[PDB]
Amino acid sequence: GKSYPTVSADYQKAVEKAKKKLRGFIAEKRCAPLMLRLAWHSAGTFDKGTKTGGPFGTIKHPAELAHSANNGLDIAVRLLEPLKAEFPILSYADFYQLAGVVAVEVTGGPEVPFHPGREDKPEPPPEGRLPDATKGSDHLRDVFGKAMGLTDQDIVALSGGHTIGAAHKERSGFEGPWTSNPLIFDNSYFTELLSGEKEGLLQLPSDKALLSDPVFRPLVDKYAADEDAFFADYAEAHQKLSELGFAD
Ligand code: HEM
Ligand SMILES: [K+]
Numbered sequence: 001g002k003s004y005p006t007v008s009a010d011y012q013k014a015v016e017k018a019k020k021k022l023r024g025f026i027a028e029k030r031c032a033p034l035m036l037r038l039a040w041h042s043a044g045t046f047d048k049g050t051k052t053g054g055p056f057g058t059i060k061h062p063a064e065l066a067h068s069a070n071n072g073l074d075i076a077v078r079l080l081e082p083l084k085a086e087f088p089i090l091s092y093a094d095f096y097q098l099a100g101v102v103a104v105e106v107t108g109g110p111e112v113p114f115h116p117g118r119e120d121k122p123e124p125p126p127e128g129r130l131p132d133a134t135k136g137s138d139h140l141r142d143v144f145g146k147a148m149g150l151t152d153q154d155i156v157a158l159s160g161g162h163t164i165g166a167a168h169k170e171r172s173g174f175e176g177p178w179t180s181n182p183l184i185f186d187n188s189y190f191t192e193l194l195s196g197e198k199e200g201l202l203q204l205p206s207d208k209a210l211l212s213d214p215v216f217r218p219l220v221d222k223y224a225a226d227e228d229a230f231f232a233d234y235a236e237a238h239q240k241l242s243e244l245g246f247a248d
Contacts, residue, residue: 002247005117011089015116018087018095022102025083031076032103032183033165038076039100039242040161041069042093045125046244048149053125054245056118057092064124072171093118097242107164109185110235118246133174136209137216148244154237156210156219160230161238163189167202176202190224 026032038059046054058064065074084095094116101112131143144150144158164185167174178201179188192201193211210216223230 002115002243004115004247007116011116014087014089015094015098015114018083018090019098019102019114021083021086022099023106026099026103027106029079030183031079032107032185034072034076035080035099035103036161036164038073038080039097039103040158041073041130042096042100043241043244044131044143044148045129046149047125047129047147048244049147051245053129055093055097055242056245057096057120058124059096060092061124067127067130069127069130072168090116091118091120093120093246100238100242103164104161104185104234104238107183107185110231112235112238112242114239115243115247131206133172133204133206135206137213140206140209148241150237150240152215153219153233154240156216156223157230157233157237158241159207159210160187160189160223160234162204162207163187167204174202174204176200178202178207187223187227187230190220190230193220194224 026035039055042057042059043055046052059070059073060077064070065077080095080099084090084092087095097118098114101114104110104112129143129147132139140155141152144155145152150158162178164179164182166177166182169175179186179192180201181188192198193203193207197203210220219233223233
């Protein structure tokens with residue numbers, strides 16, 4: 001159950017103006033995938049049992065940026081700082097999650113509902129909570145299930161965020177896009193994953209894990225066949241992720 005906090009009218013006005021400015025900025029800079037990854041890596045540190053981590057603005061801290069999993073996200077933070085400065089009333093936590101919602105929207109994805117009121121927290125979570133691309137389904141459930149508190153459906157739908165963007169050998173070490181159209185939010189991640197490896201496209205071991213797991217594979221098949229079902233389940237999961245630890 002979520003009970004969202006009240007924010008002032010002025011705060012609500014700034015969310016709306018920031019949403020529009022983020023559309024223009026993220027479209028022009030071609031940085032939707034990185035902005036989605038910043039929001040995801042922000043939220044994905046939540047541990048439900050201790051209620052630590054999650055989307056509370058800490059990823060901008062040099063000490064969280066310096067986590068190995070977060071290679072390259074300093075770029076994201078830097079790119080957003082001038083625009084954030086235009087919206088002093090907004091928390092960083094809300095601004096980065098709004099950026100992730102807008103990243104999905106401006107690449108043609110679902111409209112993920114957005115609620116303001118996240119407070120910036122003073123201290124980043126311990127390093128080590130983000131998923132490891134070399135591991136498989138048990139590990140995915142450890143991180144998205146046992147720590148974050150998301151469902152198996154959420155795991156597969158959120159994995160579809162790889163439909164935009166690419167890996168970089170100087171960041172993670174992996175290299176290349178998952179899809180032929182890495183600035184378009186669609187179900188291609190799943191149709192690629194099914195079709196086997198393609199010259200010039202990437203699959204992580206963690207993506208492949210989806211194919212061999214009895215619960216994940218029917219969802220991959222669903223999303224490959226029905227982009228609308230993918231969009232519905234993605235929007236549900238992204239909203240949940242963006243709200244972990246918030247408004248509970
Ligand atoms: C399931 C487990 C996860 C693993 C192991 C994983 C791993 C990775 C890796 C290794 C990269 C490449 C980083 C680089 O070299 O630039 C990456 C990027 C990406 N990830 Fe994930 N990922 C996972 C889940 C997610 C989720 C939950 C989403 C958000 C819904 C997400 C969104 C993205 C985006 C959009 C990119 C591309 C970034 C860019 O183009 O710079 N990933 N991920
Ligand atoms: K795509």
